[PDB]
């Protein structure tokens, strides 16, 4: 059922894919504002001990909602909070209470506003909260990784999490493509190994198919310390993730 699960994920990531370049149609918020929102969402997820999949789902919900709706400057953080609440309800065993999110928003939006925006997000997404994320594909990729290296998985997760910061240029790539690029980049960084043939057969993504995404992720990884938003790097500066964020990105990717 694993291959069928991966096939279903590949089929579903297209339907759940947010509109490419939705920030152009947004009259008030920009890519930098979304990056700040994702930074704050990473900080909240570490504050409440939420899973990485929860943050990935929340980012997907924000992207789809802003693709299908227009949000002003003030309500962007409310949209992010509602998406985080929905992702925690869907994925986490015990979602944080709405009062907890209201508190973490520095008492900006009340409980009623948070619940109303949650209702709006649920209506816009038509209760399609099962969007495949980078984590879901990365786990399946790890299942086809030999040998099981913890640093490889930690660095792949770190790169996938970094890819959530900038919509440009990461919303033009499928979540499977981003996960494959992250896995290959991590494998080359820590182990010096290329894209495995097992994943070549399983996914159909050859090394040259991920080359644009791979180069984009390498550019982001090289400039990760200089990035304005640093929540993910601090989060992956912990023994839980083997401190992969402190690793030096490879200077040249031999492609």
């Amino acid at each position: 059922y694993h291959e069928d699960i991966h096939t279903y994920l590949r089929e579903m990531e297209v339907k759940c894919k947010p509109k490419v370049g939705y920030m152009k149609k947004q009259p008030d918020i920009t890519n930098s504002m979304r990056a700040i929102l994702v930074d704050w969402l990473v900080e909240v997820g570490e504050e409440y001990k939420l899973q990485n999949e929860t943050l990935h789902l929340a980012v997907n919900y924000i992207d789809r909602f802003l693709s299908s709706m227009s949000v002003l400057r003030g309500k962007l953080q409310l949209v992010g909070t509602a998406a985080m609440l929905l992702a925690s309800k869907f994925e986490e065993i015990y979602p944080p209470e709405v009062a907890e999110f209201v508190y973490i928003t520095d008492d900006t939006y009340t409980k009623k506003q948070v619940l109303r925006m949650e209702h709006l997000v649920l209506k816009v997404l038509t209760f399609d909260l099962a969007a495949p994320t980078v984590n879901q594909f990365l786990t399946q990729y790890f299942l086809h990784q030999q040998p099981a290296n913890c640093k490889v998985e930690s660095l792949a997760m770190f790169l996938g999490e970094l890819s959530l910061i900038d919509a440009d240029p990461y919303l033009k790539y499928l979540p499977s493509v981003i996960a494959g690029a992250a896995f290959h980049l991590a494998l080359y960084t820590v182990t010096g190994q290329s894209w495995p043939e097992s994943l070549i057969r399983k996914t159909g993504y050859t090394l040259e198919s991920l080359k644009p995404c791979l180069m984009d992720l390498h550019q982001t990884y090289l400039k990760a310390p200089q990035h304005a938003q640093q929540s993910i790097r601090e989060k992956y500066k912990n023994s839980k993730y083997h401190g992969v964020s402190l690793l030096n990105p490879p200077e040249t990717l031999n492609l």
Binding site: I29, I36, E43, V44, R73, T108
Partner: peptide, 11 residues
């Protein structure tokens, strides 16, 4: 530092 009012930083 998760407790932030992002409206001020957005502008």
């Amino acid at each position: 530092n998760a407790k932030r009012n992002l409206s001020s930083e957005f502008a």
